[PDB]
Amino acid sequence: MKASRLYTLVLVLQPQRVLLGMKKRGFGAGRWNGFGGKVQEGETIEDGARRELQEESGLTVDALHKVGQIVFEFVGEPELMDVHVFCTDSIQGTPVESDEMRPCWFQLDQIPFKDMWPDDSYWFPLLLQKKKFHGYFKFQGQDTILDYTLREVDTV
Numbered sequence: 001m002k003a004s005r006l007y008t009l010v011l012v013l014q015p016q017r018v019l020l021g022m023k024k025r026g027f028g029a030g031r032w033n034g035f036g037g038k039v040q041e042g043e044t045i046e047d048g049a050r051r052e053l054q055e056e057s058g059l060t061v062d063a064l065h066k067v068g069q070i071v072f073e074f075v076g077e078p079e080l081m082d083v084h085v086f087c088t089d090s091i092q093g094t095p096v097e098s099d100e101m102r103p104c105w106f107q108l109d110q111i112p113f114k115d116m117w118p119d120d121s122y123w124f125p126l127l128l129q130k131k132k133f134h135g136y137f138k139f140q141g142q143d144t145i146l147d148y149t150l151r152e153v154d155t156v
């Protein structure tokens with residue numbers, strides 16, 4: 001059995017558009033994604049998600065709703081990444097580029113899947129349907145999935 005490290009991921013999903021950020025450096029650089037990062041000691045997972053959203057996108061939200069959890073495993077890495085996925089539809093400021101991320105809105109018929117992590121093609125459609133999910137993906141490097149599981153759930 002492996003140890004896991006906690007991460008968050010936040011999608012601002014509105015009726016006709018979703019906010020993504022182009023990751024400018026670090027893990028997943030070059031891919032559009034939601035905002036997020038490592039959970040810190042002492043904070044709830046939701047509050048860590050709110051913190052990362054503010055730090056990486058400039059947006060400050062009162063609350064986030066948990067929609068999924070995805071575990072990532074990489075060949076050659078002993079530690080799993082346990083990613084807790086949150087949404088909101090409700091914002092009240094403008095996104096601001098950070099060192100981590102350049103925010104950009106996408107219409108919901110223009111989700112840039114080819115420039116997102118490959119696994120997002122599987123779970124993002126459930127997020128768009130307002131379904132809840134648990135997933136697991138094993139990667140060789142950045143591009144190749146060797147094994148995965150995905151399930152819709154009623155409670156995350």
Ligand SMILES: Nc1nc2c([nH]c(=O)n2[C@H]2C[C@H](O)[C@@H](COP(=O)(O)OP(=O)(O)OP(=O)(O)O)O2)c(=O)[nH]1
Pocket residue numbers: 007008009010026027028033034035036037038072081083100117118119120
């Ligand atoms: N959409 C998507 N997001 C992923 C996948 N794998 C993965 O870790 N993530 C998310 C979780 C986090 O939001 C982010 C990874 O955290 P990070 O490296 O940006 O963490 P951080 O901000 O604390 O890092 P840093 O500034 O210290 O370098 O990417 C994936 O396959 N798909």
Ligand code: NA
Pocket residue numbers: 036037038052055056100
């Ligand atoms: Na971060």
Ligand code: NA
Pocket residue numbers: 035036037038056100
């Ligand atoms: Na990050």
